[PDB]
Amino acid sequence: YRYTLPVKAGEQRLLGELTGAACATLVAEIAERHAGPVVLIAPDMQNALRLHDEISQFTDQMVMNLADWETLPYDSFSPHQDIISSRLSTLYQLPTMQRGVLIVPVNTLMQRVCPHSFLHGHALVMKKGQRLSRDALRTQLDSAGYRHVDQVMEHGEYATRGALLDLFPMGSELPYRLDFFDDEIDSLRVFDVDSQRTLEEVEAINLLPAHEFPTDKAAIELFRSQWRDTFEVKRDPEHIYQQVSKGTLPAGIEYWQPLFFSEPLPPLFSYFPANTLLVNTGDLETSAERFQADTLARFENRGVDPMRPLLPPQSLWLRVDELFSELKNWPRVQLKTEHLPTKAANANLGFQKLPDLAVQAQQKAPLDALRKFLETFDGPVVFSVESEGRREALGELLARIKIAPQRIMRLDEASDRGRYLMIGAAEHGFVDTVRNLALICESDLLGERVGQPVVHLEHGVGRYAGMTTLEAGGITGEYLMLTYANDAKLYVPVSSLHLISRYAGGAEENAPLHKLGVAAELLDIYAQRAAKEGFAFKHDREQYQLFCDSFPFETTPDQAQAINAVLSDMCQPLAMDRLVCGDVGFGKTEVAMRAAFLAVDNHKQVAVLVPTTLLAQQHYDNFRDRFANWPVRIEMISRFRSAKEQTQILAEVAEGKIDILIGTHKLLQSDVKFKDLGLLIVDEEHRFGVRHKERIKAMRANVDILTLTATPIPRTLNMAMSGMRDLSIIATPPARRLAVKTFVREYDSMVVREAILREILRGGQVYYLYNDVENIQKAAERLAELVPEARIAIGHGQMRERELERVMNDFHHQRFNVLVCTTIIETGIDIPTANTIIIERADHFGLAQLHQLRGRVGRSHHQAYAWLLTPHPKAMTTDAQKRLEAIASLEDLGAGFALATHDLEIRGAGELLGEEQSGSMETIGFSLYMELLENAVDALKAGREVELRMPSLLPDDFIPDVNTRLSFYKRIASAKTENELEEIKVELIDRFGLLPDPARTLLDIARLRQQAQKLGIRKLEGNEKGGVIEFAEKNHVNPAWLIGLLQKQPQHYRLDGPTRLKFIQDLSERKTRIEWVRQFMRELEENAI
Incomplete structure (x- = not known):
């Protein structure tokens, strides 16, 4: 094609x-x-x-x-032998592979592996008719390195019960049972780790060493x-000599690998088949050198503590000279992003960078560039x-420009004049000018980043009050x-005038x-919600089965049980009030998604x-992804x-x-009116x-409130444990969640550097x-x-939305590792790849906040740490010590x-x-x-703006019971x-006596609103400093009289807009403001036309 291959x-x-x-x-x-093969270095x-x-x-x-x-070079952690099963297995298939790409970094390629005689000397293939005794096979596995257990579940274990020998090989990902008979293998049956029953029988199976x-x-x-021979022995039961002599293995024993073979560990280049084609990326002379320098530095820093000394880095890792001498034994194709001028063994491929494509809502046409x-x-x-789901997010996005991309599976299918779409983790686009093809990734539509007050510093702020003479x-x-x-x-001496500065706060x-x-x-809300009956949801079996299949x-089993309880409660006439309190990262969201x-x-x-x-954005993305195949509209509302x-x-x-509206506190602002609400x-x-929490409950009395959380506040936790609300605990897998490690250390630059590196x-x-x-x-x-x-970015909620959103989006796409963040990430942002959280000063944080932050790391099969840096402990407050000892107590x-x-x-x-x-x-x-709730319920069953910045309500001391208050x-x-307002006033006086100031203000506000509704003032406002009259589209204000008012008191009447009239009045007193507004509106209505 465009270039030949090196053979x-x-x-x-x-x-x-x-x-x-x-x-x-x-x-x-x-x-x-x-x-x-192709070995991608x-x-x-x-x-x-x-x-x-x-x-x-x-x-x-x-x-x-x-x-x-x-782990890290010369670390103190085991490789978590499951990974070892993934490593030996490859090393067994690597000498004999004919097609495929094997990806190795420089860190792993510079490492040295076992001689492969341990591979095909400790590794077996067992067929049906093997004349091998029970004990012979048992000792075979023991010598290989298997662990004898009775509940074999993971890699590198086996159990025996008379003639039933069940082992989990490191070749396959499933265990097997042999069912010996007369010292021969009768069956080779795979059995599940969860049901412990056979699924099928394999004629021949391969097993690998522990x-x-x-x-x-x-x-x-x-x-x-x-x-x-190499090191010296010290009589101490933790020294890794007398600790391996006993029989157990130290934590990081894997770096003492060469001591077990009496033969140098090959450079792994022997493992490649005869004809491989190494493909490079970036450069190796820099990455290999950096890795060698780091390894040598850590070997010198950690080549101390004569208990557990370290081997030379040349006995475990190739020298860079050795690596670059051994790379000359294979053909190589070097992919680099620069203009190679001209020569043989050198080619150029037109792959221009994509033009300026971006989307922004600033202009009328967002997709102008596209x-x-x-x-x-x-x-x-x-x-x-x-x-x-993202496909849809880009399919209706291109619908504005009248283009529907046909989906293709391989890039070769692209025709000449074709707009296509494909799914994959490609990040950036290109313009392959050689065939005039173009690839546009998702990130190529975003672009780049887008009486005078006086201060005296000795004391503070005062009010200048003149000059005086004092003895x-x-x-x-x-x-x-x-x-x-x-x-x-x-009294400041006039001589000391220089500490008297003018106020600067504006x-x-x-x-x-x-x-x-x-x-x-x-x-009243509780009585109203417990009085009537909520919606009895109708559940479809097979149609919901498709959603389950998604x-x-x-x-x-616990998440599924919570799901079943939720659905069973939703499917009842009673209003659902439940809690889903399970530990972070245990799939709490999915139960809510099924309920939705x-x-x-x-x-x-x-x-x-x-x-x-x-959280709004993340849940918007997750819900859109999950509901990417249903006729359900999902939208997000927030300040973004x-x-x-x-x-x-x-x-x-x-x-x-x-049908789904994900929103922050904006949802409770009284302007969010749902047509038919049935689930919160x-x-x-x-x-x-x-x-x-009850703001939305008051409006829709019988809404079914589903409540998800990990650390409930004590009130709602007691409320749940006391039976007021149903409870559902999810404390279980997801399978490969791993015990987030907690370290409470005093602050140290070296600790932070070590953790981040x-x-x-x-x-x-x-x-x-x-x-x-x-x-x-x-x-x-x-x-x-x-x-x-x-690479460090800054993320917090106090900067502009278009910046925080883009920074968080970049963090998802691995554009930087560290993100110096505020507590905005305490609410449950998932980001599985993040598995190390460092709290700079954790003394002043609640237990709930600390646990939530610790719950942000992990979320995957990886081992995640959680450092909670603290000041010097004596400076910490006692409650900080208690909370830190409690949080570090529970891991x-x-x-x-x-x-x-x-809590x-x-x-x-x-x-x-x-x-x-x-x-x-x-x-x-x-x-x-x-x-009290039952009493209110029974009593209720047999039943059934001119704002002036002042309290206008019926106080509790006026009407104790709530239902009477709401009725009035x-x-x-x-x-x-006004006649009915007077009747209400007389009824109030008859039934309760004197009217408090809030009650009279409420009644006169009702009267004023009644007058304004007839007049045409849609919103008459007032504060201590004045107010605004916001008329209707067609008000009934006499124009000539209005202009007369304006020209007689310009200071007190100013039209700022088509219907906004600002008046400035020193309305200090509520009564005086009430009467001034009354007379203003009265003189208005007397001239109404």
Whole structure:
């Protein structure tokens, strides 16, 4: 094609011009026409994973990585032998492979592996008619290195029961049972780890050794001999000599691998088949050198502690000279993104970078660049979307420019004038000018980043109050007198004028003055919701089965049980009030998604409420992905959405066309009116408070409230445990969640650097919580210097939305590892790749907050740490010590509920009938609460703007019971005549006596609104400083008289807009404001036309 392939001893083939996301397609092309393996030598482990997700998009060849030890050179952690099973297995198939791509970083390629005589000397194939005794096979496995257990579940274990020998080989991912008979294998049956029953029978099966070093007694004797040969022995039962002599293995024993063989570990280049074709990326002379330097530095730093000494780095890792001498034994194709000028063994491939394509809502036409680019491109263009739901997010996005991309499976299918789309992890696009093809990825539509007050510094802020003469012991001196708070006079000598500075806050008339030197509403809501019957959802079996099939996991028995309880409760006439309190990351969201699917199948406009914008966006993405194959409309509302589209969303929701609306506190602002609400889902309830939780409940009395959380606030936890609300605990798998490690250390730069470098070398991402927007810029800048290897961004909710959104989006796409963040990431942002969180100052954080932050790491098969940096402990407050010792005391999966029940009964449950969820508060007992609720329910069953910034209500001391209060509210608000308002007033006086000031203000506000409704003033406002009259489209104000008022008092009447009239009045008193407004409106209506 465009270039030949290198087939010789060590010849090179340098290809240039390959832009981003071009090396992947080039590797895919090479692997499809080379009759042999391709070993892709990535320059960095991170990059390797990237290619593993890109090449697999463009080809069908077996693209697989080489599982490296997840630890660090000379670390103190085992490789978690499961990974070892993924490593030996490859090493067994690697000498004999004919087609496929094997991806190795420089870190793993520079490592040395076992001699392969341990591979095909400890590894077996067992057929049906094997004349091998029971004990012979048992000792065979024991010498191989298997562990004798009785409940074999994982890799490298076997169990025996008489004639039933069941072993889990490291060749396959499933165990097998032999069912011996007469010292012969009768059956070779695979049995499940969960059901313990046979699925089928395999004629021949392969098994691999437990570890990468021999473990039998002869191996231990050889290890001891090599140890006494190389190092020196110390009599101490933790020294890794007398610790391996006993029989157990130290933590990081894998770096003492050469001691078990008595033969040098080959460079792994012997493992490649005869004809491989190494494909490079970036450069190796730099990455290999950096890895060698880091390994040598860590060997010198850790070549101490004579107990557990370290081997030379040349006995475990190839020298860079050895690596680059051994790379000359294979042909190589070097993919680099630069213009290679001209020569043989050198080619250029037109892969220009994509033109300026971006989307922005600022202009009238957002897709201007796209619409103009797709018109003037003669060749094909293929969009690349990472997810299936994302495809829709890009399919209706291109519908505005009248283009429907036909989907293709391989890039070769692109016709000449074709707009196509494909799914894969491609990040950036290109313009292959050679065939005039174009690839446009999802990130190529975003672009780049887008009486005078006086201050005296000694004391504070006072009010200048003139000059005075004062005697001071026979000396009369002149002073300037300042009146601080509480009329405390301070006399500054006129000579000392320089400490008297002018106020700088721009609030000369709003400056401070330093000192020198709910039960009813909640009861009624509970009674109303417990009085009537909620919607009885209708459940479809097979149609919901498809939605279940859409889930790419298996619900763990506890998550499935919570799901069943939720659906069973929704399918009842009673209103569902439930809690889903399970530990973080255990699939809590999916239960809510299933409940939402059940509700929306009956057209009930599920409403999701999350206490942060990032949760809103993440749940929007997740819900859109899951519901990417149903006729359900999902929309997000928050401050991120513009003011022009938020109104559109509200109109759509009120119309009844958006069936899922995910929103922050905006959902409770009284302007979010649902057409037909039947399901609410409050996620992370412990960051809302009682008011926000029942605000929506009051409007839709019988809505079914689903409540998800990990650490409930004590009030709602006691409420659930006492039976007021149903409870569902999810403390179980997801399978490969791993026991987030907790370390409570005093702050240290070396600790932070070590943790960040450990995470970076793993390829993950680090959370670095600072939680102070003022100094977060300085903190991130300082961390950038502390760890130059890391890429650092800043993320918090106090910067502009278009910036925070893009920064968080970039963090998803691995554009940087460390993200110095505030507590905005405490609410449940998933980001599976992030598995190390560093809290700079954790002393001042609640147990719930600390556990939630610790729950952000992990979320996957990886081992995740959680460092909680603290100041010097004596400086910490006692409660900080208690909370830190409690949080570090509980490091287990499912511990989020024990911690919640500790935070309750340490802080105590709050007022059950009121606010203040956390605290003793001397709350009323549950027996009393149920009695009052039943009493209110029974009493209710046999039943059934001119705002002036002043209280206008019926106080509790006026009308104790709630139902009477609500009835009179309805009667006053619905009264359409002053006569009926007077009747209500007389009824109030008859039944309760004197009218409090709030009651009289409410009644006269009702009267004023009644007058204004007839007149035409839609919104008459007032504050202490004045007010605004907002007339209607067709008001009844006499124009000539209005102009007369304007020209007689310009200062008190100013038209600012078509219908907004600002009046400025020093309305200090509520009564005076009421009467001034009364007379203003009266003189208005007398002239009404």
